[PDB]
Amino acid sequence: DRQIKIWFQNRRMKWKK
């Protein structure tokens, strides 16, 4: 259930918030 983050974090490394 880790892909739940990278799913949108993979391109939001800086826009995580």
Question: Care to give the gist of this entry?
Answer:
With 17 residues, the chain is mainly alpha-helical.
| SSE succession | H
Give the overall shape, derived from the CA principal axes: elongated
- Count the beta strands: 0
Structural class: mainly alpha
Count of alpha and pi helical runs = 1
Radius of gyration: 7 Å
What helical percentage do the residues reach? 40-55%
User: How much of the sequence is in beta strands?
Assistant: under 5%
Largest sheet: none
Q: Distance between termini?
A: 19 Å
Structure explained in plain terms:
- It is a single chain.
- The chain is an all-alpha fold and 17 residues long.
- It has one helix spanning 3-9.
- The radius of gyration is 7 Å and the shape is elongated.
- The chain starts with a helix and ends in an 8-residue tail after the last helix.
- The PDB classes it as lipid binding protein.
Question: What's the SSE blueprint?
Answer:
Elements: H1 3-9
Provide key terms for this protein:
elongated
